[PDB]
Amino acid sequence: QTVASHVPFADLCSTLERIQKSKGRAEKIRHFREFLDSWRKFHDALHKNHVTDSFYPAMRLILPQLERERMAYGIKETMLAKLYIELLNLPRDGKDALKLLNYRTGDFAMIAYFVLKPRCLQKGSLTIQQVNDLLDSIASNNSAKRKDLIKKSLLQLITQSSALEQKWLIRMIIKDLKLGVSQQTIFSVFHNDAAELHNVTTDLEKVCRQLHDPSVGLSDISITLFSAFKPMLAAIADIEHIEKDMKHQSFYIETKLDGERMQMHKDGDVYKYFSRNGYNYTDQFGASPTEGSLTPFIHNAFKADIQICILDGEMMAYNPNTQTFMQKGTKFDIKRMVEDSDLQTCYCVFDVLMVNNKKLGHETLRKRYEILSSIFTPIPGRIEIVQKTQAHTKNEVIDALNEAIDKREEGIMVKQPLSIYKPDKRGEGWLKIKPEELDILIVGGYWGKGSGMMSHFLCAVAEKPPPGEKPSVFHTLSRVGSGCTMKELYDLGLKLAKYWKPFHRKAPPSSILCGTEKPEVYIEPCNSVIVQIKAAEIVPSDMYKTGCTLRFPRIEKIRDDKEWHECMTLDDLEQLR
Ligand SMILES: Nc1ncnc2c1ncn2[C@@H]1O[C@H](COP(=O)(O)OP(=O)(O)OP(=O)(O)O)[C@@H](O)[C@H]1O
């Protein structure tokens, strides 16, 4: 016997409707308080004699974006449209039908409601349980790729509900209630302790079950093994005011990695992995050392004394042949090459929350790092400790950021050493710093510092030729990193290899004029390629012929659609200043 099997889904939607149309935050909260309170009174009425029953059946429909039990619905609003058209017998070429089908972004539920309103007169039949039953069935049949059984499940949902129930059903499926009150507000009204508990278990059900009585608190809410906690986040930081931000004492600068944030929970032969939103990615990485794309290659990297631990880090795609991490944005397909063994998952770890019996959240950052060094012996390309150093200078933070960008990382992290780990709070001890479009030509290259492959390109601008003429002279403007973080850079290097020529300071080429800075090798401009380069500003320089250069230059794309003679010019450079 359960409450949701007794409460009409209609009661829920009335409350949702009463909430949405309310202007003030106070009136909004009030309708929900009212709903929560009747649920509670009835539960006690129901369970006097009796429990695992809880508010969850409703809570999961009220904060549907926090659903974690039920997988994706795989329902497209077009299906809904076509379905309603067939169902309601609407003229397939009329305004209603077309409004639904060609919906962009007064949302889809509103449009459906206004079509349903004069046409659907039924009162609802479903209980909150039944709706939940029906949604289960939709998610399940989506996983099975059974469209007929989704259609049929939607059918039971729709024809058994009222128009308003249908409006909210849709929002519950799209996972956007548009209520006008934050989820944090909702949790606060539900329980003093809800929000905090959810931050250490991304799980509505435990939230509701464990905090069913509003007057019983939990004494020690903490990160538990195999419970998904929300990751600690980093605050945006101004470079000019960083020393103060770090309280004028010594701090950590750590590499900022652009990958999939992931937590690993390990107890002996047993593994779980959770993403930033508390989704279970174990099947991918491996539950056991005999299964997965990662666990088997790292299981034996854990030191002898280590039975249980919890790590925080970034999953990267690593290329063994070039010893590089692959960035998110590429014309190529990371998800499939990783599967095809041209690439491999590498876990890049920057924090530990527990080891064996002890819980580390309230340890200072310094101690967790110290501990981290004793959990496993790193394996390059599978599981690494993130590169970091100790610093105290604004200049240092600048030097680190240049170095990061040159190596094609997105930025750097700055972290205060005494800081504890605060799940889902952004800032505190953790800061992130990122930099804060030219089409120019590659005219030279460098090896060393990377590998074979090139570490950097020397790039230049065109001196505007006579009319009818292609350019013949180039002025160097900037070095830039060419680490193969994307396959197109890899491909470029191989296309370009036949063209490199030794650069001689004592007898340079007439086509490329250099400043103090000299390439090891150059390339005749006609044989080369335009790169599109992102840069923060143009700053003075003696190293390059232009008398200026690019701060934080990154290559965005290779412009194979342009021609070498289409290079931006000194004059093009003038205007950018
Ligand atoms: N070394 C690290 N320590 C802590 N958090 C990190 C680290 N590296 C990456 N992150 C996480 O990644 C986020 C990166 O910031 P942002 O999204 O602006 O950069 P990005 O590289 O373009 O993004 P992505 O990392 O998703 O590609 C941060 O919020 C942080 O939570």
Distance CA 491, CA 504 (A): 27
The dihedral built from the CA positions of residue 520, 522, 528 and 532, taken in this order, carries a sign that is positive
Size of the chain in residues = 577
Q: Whose CA is nearest to atom 25 of ligand 1?
A: 258
437-577 has which CATH code? 2.40.50.140
254 is in an annotated binding site: yes
Q: Are 481 and 554 in contact (CB under 8 A)?
A: yes
Query: Is residue 414 within 8 Å of residue 245, measured between CB atoms?
Result: yes
Q: Give the number of other Cβ atoms within 10 Å of residue 9's Cβ.
A: 29
Q: Mark whether 256 is an active-site residue.
A: yes
The secondary element (H helix, E strand) that includes residue 39 is helix 25-46
- Please give the backbone phi and psi of residue 252, each rounded to the nearest 5 degrees, phi first: -100, 135
- Cβ neighbours around 267 below 10 Å, total: 14
Amino acid at 327: Q
Helix axes 163-174, 147-159, angle to 10 degrees: 140
Helix (H, G, I), strand (E, B) or coil at 56: helix
State the Cα–Cα distance between residues 278 and 274, nearest whole angstrom.
5
Burial of 430 (0-12, 13-18, 19+ CB in 10 A): buried
End-to-end CA gap in the chain: 73
> How many CB atoms sit inside 10 A of residue 345's CB?
24
Q: Return left, alpha or beta for 247; rule: phi > 0 is left, psi -120 to 50 is alpha, else beta.
A: left
DSSP-assigned states of every residue in 235-282: EE--GGGHHHHTTTS-EEEEEE--SEEEEEEEETTEEEEEETT--B-H
Strands 521-522 and 501-502: antiparallel
Residues with CB under 6 A from ligand 1: 233-234, 254-258, 261, 314, 328, 350, 386, 410, 413, 432, 434
Residue ranges with strand state E in 50-156: none
Can you give the resolution of this entry in Å? Answer: 2.8
Six token digits for residue 568: 């931006």
Task: For residue 124, list its beta bridge partners.
Answer: none
What residues pair up with 431 in beta bridges, in sequence order?
235, 414
Can you read off the two tokens belonging to residue 1?
């016997």
224-436: CATH topology is D-amino Acid Aminotransferase; Chain A, domain 1 (3.30.470)
Residue whose CA lies nearest to ligand 1 atom number 18? 434
Question: Do the Cβ atoms of 519 and 503 come closer than 8 Å?
Answer: yes
Q: Give the active site residue among 28, 167, 230, 256.
A: 256
Q: Name the DSSP class of 187.
A: H
How do 324-326 and 521-522 pair as beta strands? unpaired
Which residues are paired to 481 by β-bridges? 456
User: Distance (Å, rounded) from C-alpha 533 to C-alpha 394?
Assistant: 26
Of the residues 229, 236, 258, 436, which should be mutated to test ligand 1's pocket, given the most ligand atoms within 8 Å of the CB? 258
Rounded distance between C-alpha atoms, residue 229 and residue 278, angstroms: 7
CA of 258 to the centre of ligand 1 (A): 6
Q: Which atom of ligand 1 is nearest to the CA of 254?
A: 1
In three state form, how does the secondary structure of 543-571 look? CCCCCEEEECCEEEEEECCCCHHHCCEHH
Pocket test for ligand 1, best of 325, 368, 410, 434 (most atoms within 8 A of CB): 410
Measured in Å, residue 179 CA sits from the centre of ligand 1 at 30
Which among 254, 553, 230 is positioned nearest to 432, based on CA atoms? 254
Q: Which of 533, 534, 529 is nearest to 561 (CA)?
A: 529
82 carries a ligand binding annotation: no
Show Cβ contacts of residue 574 under 8 Å, excluding neighbours closer than 6 positions: none
Ramachandran region, residue 417 (left: φ > 0; alpha: ψ -120 to 50; beta: rest): alpha
Beta bridge partners of 265: 272, 310
- Helices assigned H by DSSP within 178-275: 183-190, 194-200, 204-210, 242-245
- 77-88 vs 108-116: helix crossing angle, rounded to 10: 0
CA distance 84 to 101: 10
Q: Which of 532, 525, 541 is nearest to 560 (CA)?
A: 532
Mutate to test the pocket of ligand 1, among 261, 372, 409, 421 (most ligand atoms within 8 A of CB): 261
For residue 259, report the distance from its CA to the centre of ligand 1, in Å.
7
Radius of gyration of the chain from its Cα atoms, rounded to whole angstroms = 30
Nearest residue (by CA) to ligand 1, atom 6, is 256
C-alpha closest to that of 471 among 557, 376, 571: 571
505 is in an annotated binding site: no
Q: Is 517 annotated as a binding residue?
A: no
Supply the residue whose CA is at minimum distance from atom 2 of ligand 1. 256
**Domain 1-223 top-level CATH class:** mainly alpha
Flag whether 251 is marked binding: no
Atom of ligand 1 nearest to the CA of 234: 29
Ligand 1 centroid distance, CA of 19 (Å): 36
User: Are 447 and 500 contacting, i.e. CB atoms less than 8 angstroms apart?
Assistant: no
Contact between 442 and 496 (Cβ < 8 Å): yes
List Cβ<8 Å contacts ≥24 apart for 538-542: 538/573, 538/576, 538/577, 541/515, 542/515, 542/516
> Tokens 């590169």 appear where?
387
Pairing, β 426-433 against β 456-462: unpaired
Is 244 labelled as part of a ligand binding site? no
Please report, for the chain, the start and end positions of each structural domain, with discontinuous segments joined by +: 1-223, 224-436, 437-577
Nearest-atom number in ligand 1 for the CA of 348 is 1
User: In whole angstroms, what separates CA 2 from the centre of its chain?
Assistant: 38
Comparing C-alpha atoms, which of 350, 28, 52 is closest to residue 177?
28
- Reduced DSSP (H G I as helix, E B as strand, rest coil) percent helix, strand, coil of the chain, to 5: 35, 20, 40
| Separation of alpha carbons 559 and 345, rounded Å | 29
Strands (E), 358-425: 358-359, 383-385, 388-391, 411-415
The two three-digit tokens of residue 255, written as one number: 């590499």
Neighbouring C-beta atoms of residue 519, cutoff 10 Å: 25
Q: Distance between CA atoms of 165 and 374, rounded to whole angstroms?
A: 56
Q: Dmax over Cα atoms in the chain, in whole Å? A: 97
> Which of 432, 433, 434, 534 best tests ligand 1's pocket when mutated (most atoms within 8 Å of CB)?
432
